Ligand binder design. Structure first.
Ligand SMILES: CCCC(=O)OC[C@@H](COP(=O)(O)O[C@@H]1[C@H](O)[C@H](OP(=O)(O)O)[C@@H](O)[C@H](O)[C@H]1O)OC(=O)CCC
Length: 143
């Protein structure tokens, strides 16, 4: 199985240094108001050695997964790029928002771990790359 490892090594070598290799949740923050929602604070590490924070709420995760399913899922009429996508924790219509967010920490950690282990054509999808890059608002915060 030496051939397999050597190939795995060759393929990784070709990825740009800014590709994400891990993403783990560091905390959650409540955004108060007429209606409140929660934001996940995520620590990302890249192939090139960078480490930084991004801030994402659940509906941003759901919008990304909807795109991936249309492009690489079962009902995706593009067979060539099809693969097994991880399932995203489901929507919860009603309930205590802070408890729902806390329950999603380990579930979203598993989903991100599985996503970053997918084939190169998914890792390089422009929307997946944008989701893990620092937006201007993420980078102007002091960790
Ligand atoms: C007739 C009544 C139908 C009905 O209740 O629809 C409601 C929505 C479901 O509501 P959504 O807003 O699409 O979905 C909610 C957001 O994803 C929210 O994200 P965040 O934490 O970042 O705020 C999650 O926390 C909630 O658990 C989830 O339910 O459904 C859709 O948007 C599909 C269109 C029908």
């Amino acid at each position: 199985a030496v051939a397999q490892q050597l190939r795995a090594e060759s393929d990784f070598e070709q990825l740009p240094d800014d590709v994400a290799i891990s993403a783990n949740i560091a905390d959650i923050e409540e955004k108060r108001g007429f209606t409140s929602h929660f934001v996940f604070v995520i620590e990302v590490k890249t192939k090139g050695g960078s480490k930084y924070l991004i801030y994402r709420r659940y509906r941003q995760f759901h919008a990304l997964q909807s795109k991936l399913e249309e492009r690489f899922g079962p009902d995706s009429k593009s067979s060539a790029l099809a693969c097994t996508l991880p399932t995203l924790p489901a929507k919860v219509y009603v309930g205590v928002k802070q408890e729902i967010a806390e329950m999603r920490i380990p579930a979203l950690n598993a989903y991100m771990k599985s996503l970053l282990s997918l084939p190169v054509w998914v890792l390089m999808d422009e929307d997946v790359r944008i989701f893990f890059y620092q937006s201007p608002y993420d980078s102007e915060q002091v960790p």
